[PDB]
Write an enzyme that holds these catalytic residues in place. Structure first.
Site, PDB file in Angstrom:
ATOM      1  N   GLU A  31       0.840  -1.192   0.000  1.00 58.77           N
ATOM      2  CA  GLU A  31       0.000   0.000   0.000  1.00 58.77           C
ATOM      3  C   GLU A  31       0.878   1.246   0.000  1.00 58.77           C
ATOM      4  OE1 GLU A  31      -3.216   1.080  -0.290  1.00 58.77           O
ATOM      5  OE2 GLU A  31      -2.285   3.064  -0.097  1.00 58.77           O
ATOM      6  N   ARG A 103     -17.280   5.847   5.500  1.00 59.48           N
ATOM      7  CA  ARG A 103     -16.295   5.159   4.661  1.00 59.48           C
ATOM      8  C   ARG A 103     -15.000   4.875   5.410  1.00 59.48           C
ATOM      9  NH1 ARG A 103     -15.326   5.162  -0.803  1.00 59.48           N
ATOM     10  NH2 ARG A 103     -17.102   6.573  -1.078  1.00 59.48           N
ATOM     11  N   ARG A 181     -17.844  16.036  -1.648  1.00 60.70           N
ATOM     12  CA  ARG A 181     -18.146  15.021  -0.646  1.00 60.70           C
ATOM     13  C   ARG A 181     -17.653  15.489   0.705  1.00 60.70           C
ATOM     14  NH1 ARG A 181     -15.266   9.686  -1.354  1.00 60.70           N
ATOM     15  NH2 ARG A 181     -14.088  10.274  -3.228  1.00 60.70           N
ATOM     16  N   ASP A 305     -11.863  -0.700  -8.773  1.00 56.71           N
ATOM     17  CA  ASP A 305     -11.952   0.492  -9.604  1.00 56.71           C
ATOM     18  C   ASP A 305     -10.845   0.551 -10.652  1.00 56.71           C
ATOM     19  OD1 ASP A 305     -14.258   1.411  -8.289  1.00 56.71           O
ATOM     20  OD2 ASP A 305     -13.336   3.328  -7.702  1.00 56.71           O
ATOM     21  N   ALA A 318     -17.987  -0.126  -4.191  1.00 56.13           N
ATOM     22  CA  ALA A 318     -17.440  -0.893  -3.077  1.00 56.13           C
ATOM     23  C   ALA A 318     -18.023  -2.300  -3.043  1.00 56.13           C
ATOM     24  CB  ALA A 318     -17.705  -0.175  -1.752  1.00 56.13           C
TER      25      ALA A 318
END
Ligand SMILES: Cc1cc2nc3c(=O)[nH]c(=O)nc-3n(C[C@H](O)[C@H](O)[C@H](O)COP(=O)(O)OP(=O)(O)OC[C@H]3O[C@@H](n4cnc5c(N)ncnc54)[C@H](O)[C@@H]3O)c2cc1C
Ligand SMILES: CC(C)=CCc1cccc2c3c([nH]c12)C(C)(C)[C@H]1C[C@]24CCC[C@H](C)N2C[C@@]1(C3)NC4=O
Ligand SMILES: [Cl-]
Length: 412
Positions: A31, A103, A181, A305, A318
């Site tokens: 990551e 989220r 958002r 995605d 998701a």
């Protein structure tokens, strides 16, 4: 034992890691960020993903998501004048079905579980180099070659892996819409006399409102029984101020978007009380269907995605990332160590048409949603469609049922 490398640990990569580990594979996960760092807005997880999650730790993960949910009873749908146009049920998102949830909270729950399983997780790893042979595949981190049997690339819509795996012909592209958002603490808002319609009289029940006008949609909600407030704005833009990557927003721009809305008096306080740094914006990006998600030597695959972005009104990105992760773990398990490439190819074939059908539904719905043609209910603008072919699908049963058939076709 199959060795899997996973690159990118959003929902797609976390689910693939958890499911690969549960199916007995050895996972090394990479990551780019230093730790989980996600926007604290809300997303929805429906029944087709809850049937995956419910198997984890005798339901403890589902129970933790349930504890953190937006406890929403109904969705109130208004037009830009403030007229109530429709009230929707929360079918698919009630107790035991699915969740509307913060989220960042949901990702933290998934991450905490993945870490608890002992999965080898390596942060601060910006991966750009991929390679494969007839015998193995892997990546290059810090000039070191890391080898495995296959690589799962779940590094999001701006995937660097996708160019390496699929080639560079198909690239993400602008839809012409952009999104704001935001999520923040209700303490920041409560007391504003223009926000009483949201902050008062709701008796420990969370709220969700859609405001649907021509080329502009505003959503307003709460979470954790009135502790958190959420809002967002998807709008068609003539000249872009947002970029293809996420940026911290100046909320004053979103306030101007709704300048001609009669309801602006209700919505401006919610936007204006957003603390600095708690609103984000970006272009709404899409991508044509990739001819293939799988590398030429069939050891590498893009999922999530990176492979199949959805328009945000679909509420399936998701969910389908979770279906992807559960599916690839099964295909590797059934293929076995000596036929890993067959499992990779079957995983793509199992998912390819389903996700394309969902993408196309999202595009059709977005057009109706932005037309906002309130005069003319199966023609009315809405973000809410719950077709059984989406919500009743069980991706794991499907993989176990279809693997042998699809693998035979792949092998010939
Ligand atoms: C406004 C909005 C609302 C949405 N609402 C919903 C909803 O209600 N329901 C739903 O199901 N979906 C929803 N979605 C879609 C959903 O957010 C996405 O489909 C999903 O988050 C995609 O997850 P992912 O793991 O594929 O990618 P990402 O979440 O982008 O994760 C990719 C990961 O890879 C890492 N990474 C990137 N590049 C590299 C690299 N080179 N090396 C290493 N790591 C790398 C990133 O740091 C990140 O952790 C919504 C989307 C938007 C924009
Ligand atoms: C407010 C905010 C943080 C961002 C703005 C924003 C912009 C564009 C689309 C969406 C969607 C959401 N938010 C969007 C929700 C509310 C998370 C979801 C959740 C929910 C719940 C009911 C079922 C539908 C499909 N899903 C999708 C969705 C699409 N609408 C919704 O009613
Ligand atoms: Cl469709």
């Amino acid at each position: 034992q199959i060795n899997v490398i996973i690159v990118g640990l959003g929902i797609a990569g976390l689910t693939a890691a958890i499911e690969c580990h549960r199916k007995g594979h050895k996972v090394i996960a990479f990551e780019k960020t230093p730790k989980m760092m996600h926007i604290g807005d809300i997303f929805s997880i429906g029944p087709n993903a809850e049937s995956v999650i419910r198997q984890w730790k005798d339901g403890a993960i589902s129970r933790a998501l349930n504890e953190a949910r937006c406890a929403i009873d109904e969705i109130k749908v208004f037009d830009e004048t403030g007229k109530l146009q429709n009230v929707n049920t929360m079918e698919g998102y009630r107790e035991g079905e699915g969740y509307v949830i913060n989220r960042a909270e949901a990702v933290d729950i998934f991450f905490e579980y993945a870490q608890s399983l002992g999965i080898d997780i390596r942060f601060n790893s910006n991966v750009t180099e991929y390679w494969e042979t007839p015998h193995n595949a892997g990546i290059i981190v810090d000039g070191l070659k890391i080898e495995a049997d296959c690589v799962i690339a779940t590094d999001g819509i701006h995937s660097k892996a996708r160019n390496a795996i699929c080639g560079a012909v198909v690239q993400p592209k602008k839809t012409g819409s952009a999104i704001y958002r935001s999520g923040y603490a209700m303490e920041e808002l409560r007391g504003h006399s223009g926000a009483v319609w949201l902050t008062e009289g709701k008796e420990d029940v969370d709220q969700l409102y859609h405001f649907i006008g021509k080329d502009i949609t505003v959503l307003v909600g709460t979470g954790r029984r009135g502790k958190d407030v959420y809002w967002g704005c998807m709008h068609k833009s003539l000249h872009d101020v947002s970029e293809s990557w996420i940026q911290v927003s100046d909320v004053r721009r979103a306030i101007e978007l709704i300048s001609d809305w009669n309801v602006r008096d209700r919505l401006e306080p919610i936007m204006a009380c957003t603390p600095q740094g708690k609103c984000f914006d970006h272009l709404v990006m899409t991508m044509d269907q990739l001819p293939s998600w799988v590398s030429p030597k069939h050891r590498m695959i893009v999922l999530g995605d990176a492979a199949h972005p959805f328009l945000p009104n679909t509420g399936q990105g998701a969910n389908q990332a979770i279906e992807d992760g559960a599916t690839v773990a099964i295909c590797l398990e059934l293929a076995g160590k000596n036929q890993v490439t067959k499992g990779v190819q079957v995983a793509e074939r199992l998912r390819y048409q389903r996700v394309a059908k969902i993408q196309e539904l999202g595009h059709r719905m977005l057009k109706t949603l932005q037309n906002a043609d309130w005069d003319g209910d199966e023609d009315a603008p809405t973000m809410i469609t719950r077709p059984a072919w989406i919500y009743s699908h069980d991706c794991q049963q499907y993989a176990y049922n279809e693997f042998q058939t699809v693998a035979q076709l792949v092998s010939e």
